[PDB]
């Protein structure tokens, strides 16, 4: 069930993001994409990084301390090659600040070597207040 897989991942991805964001890197491979809001020097949304090595480096530099999340909607479906897309809507709070609404999209790809194991091929996180 793509619905169950995607929703249990959201639970895991955000439970880990709060408890140990330094261990968040194991969700990604060397072809994964990652972006988590942010703006440029000009004031426009930041670019995405690739590969677990760079994704980990970016997560640590974002300083996730006491992340809080109220997931309001998770819709998971099936893509090509036994993949699973997860659309996520909710609110996120970092460093005990205010809850900010967000729009997220995951792409769960089969790991290949182990049964029922998935990795995050794509992670597109965006804050709404930095776009709208």
């Amino acid at each position: 069930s793509p619905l169950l897989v995607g929703r249990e991942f959201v639970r895991q991805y955000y439970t880990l993001l709060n408890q140990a964001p330094d261990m968040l890197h194991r969700f990604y491979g060397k072809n994964s994409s990652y972006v988590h809001g942010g703006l440029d020097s000009n004031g426009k949304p930041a670019d995405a990084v690739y590969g677990q090595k760079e994704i980990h480096r970016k997560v640590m530099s974002q300083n996730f301390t006491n992340c809080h999340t109220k997931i309001r909607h998770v819709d998971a479906h099936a893509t090509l090659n036994d993949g699973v897309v997860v659309q996520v809507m909710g609110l996120l709070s970092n460093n005990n600040q205010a809850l900010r609404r967000f729009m997220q999209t995951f792409v769960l790809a089969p790991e290949g070597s182990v049964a029922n194991k998935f990795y995050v091929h794509n992670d597109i996180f965006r804050y709404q207040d930095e776009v709208f």
Binding site: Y13, F27, Q52, K117, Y119, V120
Partner: peptide, 5 residues
């Protein structure tokens, strides 16, 4: 490497 089911 990733999450399991």
């Amino acid at each position: 490497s990733g999450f399991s089911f």
